[PDB]
Each structure stands twice: as C-alpha cells, then as structure tokens.
Design a protein around this nucleic acid. Structure first.
Lengths: 297, 839, 119, 89
RNA sequence: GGAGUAUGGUCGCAAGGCUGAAAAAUUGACGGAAGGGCACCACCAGGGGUGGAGCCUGCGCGCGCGCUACACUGACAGAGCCAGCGAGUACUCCCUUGGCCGAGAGGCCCGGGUAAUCUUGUUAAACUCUGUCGUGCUGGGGAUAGAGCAUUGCAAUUAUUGCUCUUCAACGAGGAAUCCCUAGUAAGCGCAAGUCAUCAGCUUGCGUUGAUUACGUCCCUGCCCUUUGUACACACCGCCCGUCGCUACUACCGAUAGAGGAAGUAGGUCUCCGUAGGUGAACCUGCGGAG
C-alpha cells in the first residue's frame, strides 16, 4: 500500500510538471485556433512552427473541451469529487484539555460525516498511516493554548494538501447552557463562500468545500435547512454555522448553532501532514516589507 | 469419514485432439479427452471414463467390430487396449513410431496401422473375455505384414466389406490398394493423380468403384475399366468432381458405403454432405468458426460426429432431421473456479474464456453456458438456496443469475472502475462482498436493493480471499498485507478483528460448523484459527507435501522451485474433518483438521504433454539448443493458419493468440460434493471428479466371527429375525447383501425393525435408503422406510444436526426427486382428467 | 485526429485511449494526443518490460543481471512467480513486483541489512 | 481498469428455459422444470395506468376502481397522495 | 509604415425626482400517524475532569488553564535497575566524561566532541525488592516564615534559580450541578524541541507503564429518513391521514352588460381430347369434356 501511495504521489508531481510545459505550449496553440476562426493575422513565430501545426491537428479537441468546460483539470480532488462521501476525523494535540476536547466535539458536529479520535499516545506518522489505511479523506488537527484553541491543520489524503491556520475569536458551543442550545441537527449543510477571487482563493475554497458530503442536486435550492458560511476579509477567513427556517418567500430567520472562527491560513503545502519537507504552495510572508500591504486569497 | 478416494469420471471437457468413434449399436460416443477416453451414452443420459491414462495425449481410437475391445494410441505410439463391458485395462503395447492411421478389420481378426511411412497389419489378440480357458499372454500382438511401398505420411486406412483388401490414403498424393493374403488376380496397385495429397480412399459397397478424396477439395472415382485402346484393364478414373468450398482445404472426409453418402469437413468450419455416386449436394452448414478436424459417421448412417480440436467443439448432427443431437463445448482457457450446486447434481465452472457453464455430473454435458461477461470470469458462488448464482469477473461486474429463469437479474459494479478477482456472498443471499487487486477496499452490495452498501477498509494490500460464514454472521477477508480480518457486518457495531500472519494470504475457508477457519498463506502453511476467540489452534507446514514441479522453462531443481509450494485453494469436507488443498502444483493434499496429518495425496495428471507433471525430467530431451519441447516448430506446418504466430510478447494471462504449447499443471479450484463421497478439481486437462470406492473394497464396521453372508441369509430365511439380519448386513458392509435383506423384509415389519434399530447404524441406514430412493424402482418401499426412520428417530436428528447433515441432505434430495418427478405429473393428470370429465 | 474536433465519440475515445496508455505506463501524461503521435514507441513498451522496470526499481543493478535473476526465478509479480523475462509490468503492478518466497537474493539483502530472521 | 459501463439491453422471449439450454439428447431438468416461461408474470402482464381502462383507475395494489364509484373523500385522498408524490419529486 | 499590447490625458453617453427612511403555484404553505437507521451532544455499566484552598494566561475580591495533596495499591530509608524522540563550541566558550575539594548546592584541574565517533547505555521516573513507620492531620501534606551558604548576571531589594537548618498552615475525596470518555482509549510518568501564524504564566512532539466497564437497544432525550422515483428474477407488501392554497367549470348574492363577496364539484393440380381466336407445322390463351 505504502509503495502505491509513494508511486502515485510521484506520478502526480511529474504530471503537474508536464502540465506546466504543456501550458507554455498551449498558450501559443490557442492563438492559432482563434486566428483560424476569426481570420485575424497571427505572429510569424506561431504560424511558421511546423511541429506546432502538426501537433495542433491532433490536439484541437481538448482545447475545445476546456473552453466548453466538458473536462476537469488534473487535481487531487477531481478524481473523487461528488462520488464518495468524504470521511474526516478530528483529533487534538497530544494531551488535550477539557475545553479542547469539547471544541473537538463541536467541530466534529459541524461536519455530518466526521468522526473524532482520542489521541492519547498516538505517534503522528502512525496517525497518517492509519488514515491512509482506513481511506479517510481528511484529518483535522487542533492545537489549544490554555483551554482555547489556536490552530487547525486540515490535511487531505492520500497525498493532498495541508492548510494550517491559526484561530482567533473562538466562541465555543460549550459555553451556552443546555436550555438555550441543543443537539445540533445533522443534515447535509449548504455552503457559501464570500470573497475568494484569486486562484489561491479558489484553491482554499476547493480544500475547504471538499470536506463536506455532496448535496443531492434534485431540489437542493429549496430543501435543506442548515448553512455554513466562509467569508474572508483581509485574508482571514471567518466562518459561521447557522440553521435557518424560511418563514416566508421573502424572508428567512437565522439561528446561530455552531462555533464562530476567524481562522487565518499561514501555510498551504502540497503534501500531507507527515511531510514537514513537502513543497509549500503559499505561506504567510511576515517580516517582509510589503507582506502586510499585499492581500492574498 | 472414510478417505478412500479412487478416480471416478473426468468431466468439464468433451473432446480434445484425436479420433472420434461410435459404438456398433450406434448409441455410445467414444471421445478422447487429453489422455483419457470418455464414453457418452446417448440413449440414456450417461457418461463414464475408462480407468486408464496415457502418458501423452490420445492420437487414435479404434474399436473391434464386435464392440468389446477398444485400442487407444497415444502420441509416440504407446497403445492400451481395454475391455469396454468390464472397464478394465487389458494390454499395453508400444508401436515405436507415431501412429497416424488406424483401422480394425470388419471381420474382427486383424487391424492395420499406419506409422508414418510403414503400414503394419497386425492380428487382434485373443482375450480372456472371449476364451473360456485363457489368460493374459506376454506379448499378445502377432505382426502379420509390413508394407513400406510408400513415400510419405499414411493419412488414412480403410478396410473392405469382405475384409480381404484395404486402401491406404497418403500424403504423397497416391492411394494404394493392399490385400491381406496373396490373391489370384491381384497386384498391389497404386492410384496416382491428385494435387495436394489424399485425405481418404474408400471402397464402395460392391467393391468396384473406389473413391479418393484429396486435400484440395476434389473427389475422384476409380473403376476397373479397359484402357482407351480397346485381360488388359487398368484401375483408371471415370469422373472427377470438386467441392467448391472457396478459400479452404478439406481436413476430414468420411463415406458411408451402405447408404452411399460422403461427408466432408473443411478448414473454414463449414462441412457438407453429398449423396455420392451422382454427387448431389444434400446440404452444408457451418458448425464451427475455426475448422473441422475429425469426422465419423454412424454404422446405421443416420448420425454424424464432428470434432474441432482448437476449441472443445464436439457435435453430433442428425442430417435427415437437420438437427443437432448434441453440440458440446469444453473450456478453451484456464478454468478459474468452480462450485457444486447445493443439491449436488450439477457443478458450475467459470473459466478465463469469458463463459461460465453448468455441467451435469451424470452424463457429463454442459446444460447452460452463460455468456454475458466480456472478460475472464473469476470466482463463482452459490447461496444456501441454490437457485441463484453470483459470478465475479475482470470486466468489473459481479453478475447475479437466477437458475430457474436463466437471466442475470442483477449486475453490480463499483463506481470507480475495478476488476474483481474474488467474491463471497452471504448464505441468506442478500449481501455480496467482492474484492479486487486494483483497490484495497472491499465492496459490499445488496441483492434485493442493487446499490452499493459499503466499502469496507482496513487492508494495507489487495484482498485475495473472501468467505462468508455458513451461519451468516461473519465475513472473513484475507489479503497480501500478511493479514486477515474477521469482519462483523450484520451487527449494530461494524467491527474488524485482525489476524496477523507471516506471509500473504492465498486462501480462506470455513468449517461447516462455523467455529473454525483455515487460512492458507504464501509460505505454504495452513493455519487453523478459531472465529469466536481469535486464536490459532492448529497448523500444517505444507511445502514439501505439495512441492512437485520442474516445468519446461525452469532452470531450478523441482525441490528449489518456489511458487509451486503453496496452497492456492482449500476447502473443508462436508463432514468438516478433512481439508482438501490444491495449488499451482501436481499434488492435491487431503489433510485432517484434528490430527493434523496428511491422510492422502493425489496426482492430478499423468499426462506428459502438460508441463509440470514429473519432478525429474530426463536428459534425453535436452539438446544443445535448450530442451526439445521448446524449439518453435510452427514453420513445419502445411497450413498457413497453423503457421501464423499471432502471439503477444509476455502475456501470462490469456491472449487470443495463445501458443499454449505444453501448458502448466495447476489446480485452480477444488470443491467437495454436498452429498459427500466425492470431490472434484479443475485442472488444466479437465475437471477430475474423485469419489469413494466402497463397492470394490471390503470394509466391515465392527464385525464378529460368526457373521458371514451365509449366516446373514440363514437368519433371514430360516429364523426370520429381520432386525438381526439387517444389523448383521450393515455390520458386514457389503452393499449386495444389504440390498438383499433390505428388499427381503416386509413393509409391515419396517416399523418394528426401525423401532428396534440402533442409533449407531441410523445415519448409514439413512444414507442407504436415500441412495435406494434415488436409484432403485421400489419407491413406495423406500419412502415407507424414510417415513418410519424420521418418525422414530425424529428428536435425535434434530438434536444433533451436524453429525447427520449430509445424510439429511441426501434424503432431502431423494424426496426432492420424487416430489418433482412423479407427483406434479399425478396432480396435473388428475386435474386435467377432472376437467375433461366435467366437460 | 481525422474525426471533426467537436465530436462526442472523438472526445470519449481520446480519453479512453489516453487513460488506457497511462494506466499501462507507456505515456507519462494523459492530456495530449500528440503523446500517441510521437511518444508511443516500441522502446516505451520495451521499457515497460520486466527486467528494465526492476532495473528502474533497483531490484537489480543492470538489465542483464535482472534478466539473469528472473530466468533463475527469484522474482514474482504479485503472488505468482514469473519465469518469462518479457512480462509487461503495468503501472499498478510495479507496486507488486518483489522477490519470491525462499529467495537467496532476499537472504542476501537481509544479511546485508543485519535483519536475517531465520524463522 | 475495465471500461466505463455502457447500457446494453437483451431481448428475452417467452420460450421455456430448455430453449436457452444447450444442445443435448435430453434435458437436465425434470418434468416439472421445462414449463418456466423465462419471463415473470410481472412481464407477462402488469396492471398500470398506461394499460388501464378509460373510466377506471388502477391503485397501487393493482386493482381497478372506477372514478364514478369512488366517493368524494377517497377522491380527495388520492389527489393528496399524488400531490405528495409530486412534491417529493 | 502595417500589426498587436499597454500607460496617461481630452471629449460624448451614462447624469432630470407622481417624490419625502424603517411574487410564483395543476409544481405552493404547515403538520399528524406508522415504520426504520444512528448517536458517550441518548438509555445501560463504569471511569475521569471542573466546581473546595492558593497562583496566574485568557474571556466579560469574581473567573479560567494548571501543579501538589488529603496517605497503608502509602511515606520514608537502603537496594535492585530499565527507555525513547533530541541537542551541542569559530573566528569560540556550546554539550561535558574523568581526577581531586566540598554535607549539599557547588568549586577546581584536566579531558572527548562541529558529533551513529565525545557527553550518553542520557544507569530518566513511575517501577521492583529488603527494611523502618502503624492509622494518629501520623513519619500523610509541605503553604507560609526565620536564619545561613552558593550559582547566573553590569545588577538579584519587590526575595532569578540552586542547597542546609528551622518554622510546619489548609486540605480527611470536594457539594449541588455540569461536562467528557469505549483499547495501546482513560490515567500516571519523565526526556527533548520552540520551526514566518499561536505558544514561555506555555505549546508541540517523543518514549515508558497501561486497566475497569459497554461493545446491546431505540425504552428515555434527540438527530436523520422513508409514505415519489433510482433494476428485473425468488420472496413479501398492498390504495398512510389532516388543514388550506392554486387552476377549470357550475350556479348563487348584491351595489355600478360588472369589479367584488360567499360556495360546490373535478380451394380442380397434371395429362389428353373436341373447340374458338392468336403468327403460322408445332405453339399460346379461353372454354367444354374425359382420365
């Protein structure tokens, strides 16, 4: 099994590098197809390449399929997108506190298909090993400061990305009394994402919305009574968890049911939780000059 | 149980390379299957296999025109003649060359044989079956004449009707006429003039016209008329006419001389038969896609028998009715798996040809061939009910057939595309689990729903063997992560207890009383675990017991060949006391599960045309260019479709090219019979059914000194103590004596005998009355026996249920035969008669 | 290629052909038909053979030594020992080619690593 | 990886199972076997709305009941059940 | 000069206020009853926190995370004696063995290591044994406090930390509640690191020792879903229920053909012969007869 995970990760990295070179060529091939249909004259370096024309005659059709959106990009999520229900386990750090364990339970209840695991004495490579051995889609690690959580680590499996984020303004479910709160409904939640516009924003949108099981698309625009909101300002994604009734065709009553975060991501690594030496995709550039001026996501 | 297994019939292949034969009565069809000869009785649906076995494949069959003696020639000319009424091996005798023609004389005293250029006419040996005071001689065959007046291969030999002359058809384009003794107006003349060599030269009825059919598709008549200048006559040619089969050469023709009709089978599989002396095409049709190799005709003349060698493809054709009598097909690939039916009357096997087929154990014919899979079929399984069959295959689909309507009511696939290599099904018939080599999850669907229940997971490698427990509570998976899993699915908690092993798991089997499980690993060891408290209770290290090898293309000694030292498949007995184990090797082991010893080892094949059947190859076959069975000899073939090598480089699992010269010996599946007393194993030669030998072996149960057959019949006829006589007969254990006393006691004293019968002899008695219901025509007598037995010993059998399960199963199928065969007809008749009487 | 570019059966059989060749390991990408133009190659098949793929997996040192070792029969692919040095190892059986059961080469590797368990 | 599953339909007749059996001198089934007509009664005739009469309806039970003899309360309840199925879809 | 790509100007449109803040529906709105599935936010059996005293981050004398205990499965004193993840000194004083001195903390002389090479087998702690004490706030506990000696540092007062003597507090299992937990899990123990966010009032790893009790059931509390679909054989089931909307039609009511109000329903082949015509010997067609 382990040889298959290593081999498939190496094949994925090689295919991504080949896609970089092929994109450098296919930016030139899309000018030849647009000039053929519209008749505007093109560059001589493009029109006088015999290899480009000879291979263009075979590779028209994938460019047309990408224009129509009929195919999907080579990704770690596009293999099993809406086919499998992504199972995900939430774990603490090594010796958790009682409020960290209740918070772990609360963000377990945020996902309708998640499970929680007691860490105890569990070495982190064997944690990764057991996740790949039970075909989990995601793990989420939690770190507390003193009864208040300060970091999440959302890792996609078998070889997918980590998003490590630091938590702020955490208001737990376990602070309000049982007369006012209650047992959270476990229905498949709607999701809304607000303010993600860069390709890095669509990356974090993908690795956050593939944590939830896929919604049945027959009548999802009106059915379902539970929503989860990820909205970012100043690249600190703030998340709420509401439950709603549609009290009229023009009005809706919301009710806050879950914990509130404003998590800020500081590391997105193309590689799982065990790989400390995985190649990072983005990291929070503090101690640079304009790293506080520039806004990502 | 008694582990005394002789070899009963071969099954699962209907024809291989060789000559076909009919009985002189016309009913039995003698066909060669590898190195054995099956007899298919066609008037009553039956079949058997002669107890001999040649070292190589059969080349020729001949049969004495009285009917009694069969003479079978292997390759390299080793001949075995045998008595067909008393199926016993009589003489072994080696013609030193490869026999390429053979024909017995219709008088019965001689037989002629063509070894490549030679033509030897031999006497038929005097036999102990025919003489009163006679015995086996040493060298019984006496040669009469030898003729080497010939230049190439003798392809055919045909006697006359008065058995004084015969014709030899050749490969040097010339048929010749020979005599037995020196006649008065005869010279051994030649018949020249052809283009591609004669297929067959035949006499007429009144032996004046003789016909020659050649390979190019031309048949010529030969008469003894005068030369065109007119004592002075010459065997010359009166007319010639041609089969116009367009792009093919005829491979085998036959000629019925009493009814004057000629049949010819061609290279493109379309045969044609012609009323010869005016040559009117009676008809023609395509029986096979590949070719037709051997044609024979009935002695009556109303049936034809064709055999194609590249597939199984044996078929008998009744030409005036224009219909098949049988059209049978053996597997032309490796038989991947097999299971018995829970009745035990029919077995079903699944090969890598893509087809599965249901053979009947009696009569040896396949009764239905399901052909919906588009790739090689792996494991097939039944439920407890026995009406539904679930088959997995490499095209990604676990199909589910209903055998009372013969259509796949379900087909299951995984959403990501897998290729399932093993499967199990709950005995309730409602849950299917299946596992593949591409993904390490193990899939579970529902039969009555159709959609995927779950993907169980926890394996770090591909899952190789699945087994649902026969009570229905526990799935067990076994996988190449050196591990097994006790999956509990049906409980509210779905749990998985691992069994850590030493190497990759190859097979998993349950005990029938489900407390025990045997898992066979890649070291070659069997480990018997308990399922309640998951601890190994027993173990056999079985490398040496199965290691028999040294294939061609194997540069190790047979003792050092690893790969034929493991058990790929294991099955418990229906008793639960003996495993049976078979791998990629020549030996089948039969272990005891309590005393942990090997009770009996079997050898699947003596056939030296297969590759791994002797562990010490001889140095005569090693030239200076490798072994002699390794040089590519396709270029020395007369036909282009035989010369072409459409093979793919490096294709272990099947290709349609399939050179397949000297295939390996491997037992890919074994199964015990649910009625007991038999098992069978899918080898590469066929499907060997072994069974207990109780009628040819004295074996008393617990005998005294004053108990003889004479004393048993004395206390029967004189004393009339029926219980004492029956207990003495079951104690002697001689089936003729038991049958004699069983029929002799009366049907009013059945109840007294059963009421005072012993419970140690109750299960043997139940098995005996089940066999007597299924065989003897004393149906109401045996049903009174069964009724009295179950009414008296009712609570004992229901209390035990595990010691007597096979006896209850065979009694149940005996009354199922009587419930489906006679009483449906009786009820339908009385309702039809009531309606017709009520107008 | 000769089919028109917006054709459904052209697109479906392009994806089928590229997925089949990438699953057999001949192509290294599954997103271009020019790979089947000038990248499918008898050398690509011949390097998907068994002694070269175990040279790449470093089961042997050289393709000559690998052919000698799989003629002597130390290498199984999956669960079955392989004596043919032309067995084309696909991309998901390159994860299952390993040594045989009682292999002296396996004892040599374990004796080098000082993990020679004689049980 | 095998192939994507593409839909294939197989036309079975109303002949007995001994017409699907292979060619041999006599059948392997008994005398009771050989009348099983290879399509179930549900495929010989299934009562449905497409094969009902004009005035009548067929229920979920497979029983013809007419709209004239049906009362107002049962008409209202059948309208509510069909509207419930329409809301479910 | 042509073709693209940008950058900044200029102009034109956008850029005229019956106005003055807080629907769709033959598909819709809300339920009920029955039957399933699941859940340490449920039952059941147990375990463990927090909550009592003190310290303090954080959140808005009060609060939270913690450490140490209330002892006899213990304290003490000998004695046995066993890990794993780490780290460590160049233009330097890091990790430190051994030799003396010192009760201790420490001092001192040397020494190995830029390291699987030396510290370090990190001889770690619970733990195991043979003793002492004997249920007594006792030798359980070790807060507070006095006096002294040391180390870091330019500096130690508001006591950096270390050692010695002495002083010997509360605390006798935490209350009501409330929360969490089902196998290498709860719980004890130390060692190491400090990774662009968080974290020294701590964080995260890493090894060591390792149980009790469930592993059943939807009875309680709930959550999800069936009553439409999504596949066909066997086999089984057999029109779930209510309040309204919307649409179509029908008639009613009353003010000025008309917008509203209120309601209901949904059977002569072959051959021959005699004919008549055709293109004539013959031959063809049609008819009438016999075989």
């Amino acid at each position: 099994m382990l040889r298959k995970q290593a081999r498939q990760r190496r094949d994925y990295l090689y295919r991504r590098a080949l896609l970089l070179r092929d994109a450098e060529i296919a930016e030139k091939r899309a000018k030849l197809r647009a000039a053929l249909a519209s008749g505007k004259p093109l560059d001589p370096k493009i029109a006088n390449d015999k290899e480009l024309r000879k291979d263009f005659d075979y590779d028209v059709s994938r460019d047309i399929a990408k224009e129509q959106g009929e195919i999907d990009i080579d990704d770690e999520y596009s293999e099993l997108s809406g086919i499998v229900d992504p199972r995900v386990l939430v774990t603490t750090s090594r010796d958790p506190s009682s409020r960290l364990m209740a918070f772990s339970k609360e963000i377990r209840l945020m996902f309708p298909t998640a499970i929680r695991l007691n860490r105890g004495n569990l070495i982190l490579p064997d944690l990764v090993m057991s996740a790949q051995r039970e075909r989990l889609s995601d793990i989420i690690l939690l770190h507390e400061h003193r009864g208040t959580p300060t970091a999440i680590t959302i890792s996609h499996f078998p070889h997918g990305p980590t998003l490590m984020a630091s938590l702020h303004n955490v208001v737990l479910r376990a602070d309000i009394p049982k007369s006012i709160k209650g047992t959270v409904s476990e229905s498949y939640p709607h999701l809304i994402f607000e303010g993600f516009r860069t390709p890095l924003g669509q990356r974090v949108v993908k690795i956050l919305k593939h944590l939830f099981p896929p919604r049945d698309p027959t009548n999802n625009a009106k059915s379902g009574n539970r929503v989860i909101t990820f909205v970012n300002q100043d690249d600190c994604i703030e998340v709420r968890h509401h439950v709603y009734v549609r009290t009229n065709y023009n009005s809706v009553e919301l009710s806050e049911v879950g914990p509130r975060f404003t998590m800020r991501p500081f590391s997105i690594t193309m590689g799982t939780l065990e790989n400390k030496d995985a190649d990072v995709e983005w990291h929070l550039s503090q101690y640079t000059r304009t790293g506080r001026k520039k806004n990502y996501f | 149980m008694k582990t005394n297994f002789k070899f009963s019939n071969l099954l699962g292949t209907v024809y291989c390379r060789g000559n076909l034969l009919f009985s002189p009565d016309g009913t039995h069809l003698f066909s060669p299957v590898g190195n054995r000869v099956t007899v298919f009785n066609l008037v009553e649906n039956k079949s058997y296999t002669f107890p001999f076995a040649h070292r190589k494949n059969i080349s020729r069959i001949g049969l004495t025109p009285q009917g009694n003696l069969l003479l079978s020639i292997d390759e390299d000319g080793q001949a075995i003649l045998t008595n067909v009424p008393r199926r016993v091996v009589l003489y072994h005798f080696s013609f030193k060359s490869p026999v390429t023609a053979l024909a017995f004389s219709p008088s019965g005293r001689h037989f002629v044989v063509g070894l490549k250029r030679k033509i030897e006419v031999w006497h038929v040996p005097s036999t102990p079956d025919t003489n009163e005071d006679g015995d086996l001689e040493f060298a019984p065959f006496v040669r009469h004449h030898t003729h080497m007046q010939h230049f190439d291969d003798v392809r055919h030999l045909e006697w006359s009707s008065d058995s004084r002359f015969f014709l030899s058809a050749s490969k040097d384009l010339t048929a010749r006429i020979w005599s037995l003794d020196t006649e008065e107006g005869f010279v051994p003349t030649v018949l020249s003039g052809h283009r591609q060599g004669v297929v067959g030269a035949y006499f007429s009825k009144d032996q004046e016209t003789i016909y020659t059919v050649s390979k190019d598709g031309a048949v010529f008549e030969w008469k003894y008329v005068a030369k065109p200048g007119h004592e002075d006559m010459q065997w010359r040619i009166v007319n010639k006419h041609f089969f116009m089969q367009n792009a093919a050469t005829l491979r085998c023709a036959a000629y019925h001389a009493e009814s004057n009709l000629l049949v010819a089978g061609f290279s493109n599989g379309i045969f044609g038969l012609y009323e010869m002396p005016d040559f009117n095409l009676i008809h023609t049709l395509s029986i096979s896609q590949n070719e037709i190799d051997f044609v024979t005709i009935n002695k009556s003349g109303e049936w034809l028998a064709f055999g194609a060698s590249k597939l199984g493809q044996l078929l008998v054709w009744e030409w005036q009715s224009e219909s098949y009598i049988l059209k049978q097909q053996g597997h032309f690939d490796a038989m991947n798996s097999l299971v018995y039916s829970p009745d035990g009357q029919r077995i079903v096997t699944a090969a890598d040809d893509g087809k599965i087929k249901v053979w009947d154990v009696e009569s040896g014919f396949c009764i239905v061939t399901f052909t919906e899979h588009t790739s090689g079929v792996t494991a097939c399984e039944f439920a407890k009910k026995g009406s539904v069959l679930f088959t997995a295959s490499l095209d990604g689909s676990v199909r589910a057939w209903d055998l009372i309507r013969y259509r796949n009511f379900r087909t299951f696939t995984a959403p990501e595309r897998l290729s399932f290599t093993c499967m199990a099904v709950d005995p309730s018939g409602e849950v299917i689990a299946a596992g593949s080599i591409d993904s390490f999850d193990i899939h579970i669907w529902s039969v009555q729903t159709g959609q995927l229940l779950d993907r169980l997971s926890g394996h770090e490698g591909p899952v190789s063997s699945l087994a649902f427990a026969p009570d229905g509570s526990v799935l067990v998976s076994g996988s190449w992560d050196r591990t097994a899993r006790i999956w509990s699915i049906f409980s509210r908690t779905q749990t998985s207890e691992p069994l850590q092993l030493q190497s990759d798991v190859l097979d998993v089997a349950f005990r029938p009383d489900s407390k025990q499980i045997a898992i066979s690993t890649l070291d070659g060891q069997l480990t018997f675990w308990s399922v309640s408290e998951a601890q190994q209770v027993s173990g056999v290290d079985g490398r040496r017991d199965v290691s028999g090898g040294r294939r061609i293309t194997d540069r190790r000694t047979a003792a050092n060949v690893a790969g034929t030292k493991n058990f790929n498949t294991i099955r418990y007995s229906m008793d639960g006391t003996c495993l049976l184990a078979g791998g990629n090797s020549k030996y089948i082991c039969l272990y005891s599960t309590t005393t942990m010893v090997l009770l009996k080892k079997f050898t699947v094949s003596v056939n030296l045309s297969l590759s791994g059947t002797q562990e010490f190859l001889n140095s005569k076959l090693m030239t200076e260019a490798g072994p002699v069975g390794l040089l590519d000899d396709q270029g020395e073939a007369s036909d282009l479709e035989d010369r072409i090598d459409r093979s793919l480089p490096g294709s272990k699992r099947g290709d349609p090219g399939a050179r397949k010269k000297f295939p390996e010996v491997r037992v890919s599946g074994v199964a015990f019979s649910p009625t007991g007393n038999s098992f069978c194993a899918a080898s590469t030669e066929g499907l060997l059914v072994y069974s207990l030998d109780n009628t040819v072996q004295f074996d008393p149960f617990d005998l005294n000194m004053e108990i003889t057959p004479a004393s048993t019949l004395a206390v029967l006829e004189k004393e009339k103590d029926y219980l004492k006589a029956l207990v003495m007969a079951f104690r002697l254990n001689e089936a003729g004596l038991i049958t004699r006393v069983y029929q002799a006691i009366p049907y009013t004293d059945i109840g007294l005998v059963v009421e005072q019968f012993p419970t140690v002899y109750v299960p043997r008695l139940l098995r005996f009355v089940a066999a007597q219901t299924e065989q003897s025509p004393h149906m109401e007598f045996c049903l009174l026996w069964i009724r009295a037995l179950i009414d008296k010993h009712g609570p004992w059998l229901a209390a035990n249920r595990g010691k007597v399960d096979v006896e209850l199963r065979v009694v149940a199928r005996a009354v199922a035969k009587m419930r489906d065969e006679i009483r449906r007809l009786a009820d339908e008749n009385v309702y039809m008669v009531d309606y017709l009487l009520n107008q | 290629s000769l089919l028109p570019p917006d054709n459904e059966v052209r697109r479906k059989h392009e994806t089928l052909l590229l997925d089949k060749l990438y699953d057999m390991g001949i192509l290294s990408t599954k997103a271009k038909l020019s790979a089947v133009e000038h990248n499918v190659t008898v050398s690509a098949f011949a390097r998907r053979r068994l002694p070269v793929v175990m040279t790449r997996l470093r089961m042997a040192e050289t393709v000559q030594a690998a052919t000698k070792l799989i003629e002597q029969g130390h290498v199984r692919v999956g669960v079955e020992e392989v004596r043919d040095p032309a067995f084309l190892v696909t991309r998901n059986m390159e994860d299952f080619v390993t040594w045989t059961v009682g292999s002296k080469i396996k004892q040599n590797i374990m004796k080098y690593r000082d993990k020679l368990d004689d049980f | 990886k095998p192939k994507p599953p593409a839909p294939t339909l197989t036309v079975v007749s109303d002949v007995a199972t001994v017409a699907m059996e292979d060619a041999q001198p006599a059948t392997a089934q008994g005398v009771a076997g050989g009348e099983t007509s290879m399509i179930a009664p549900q495929e010989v005739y299934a009562p449905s709305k497409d094969t009902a009469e004009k005035g009548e309806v067929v229920t979920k039970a497979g029983i013809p009941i007419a709209k004239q003899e049906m009362s107002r309360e049962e008409k209202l309840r059948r309208r509510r059940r069909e509207k419930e199925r329409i809301r479910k879809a």
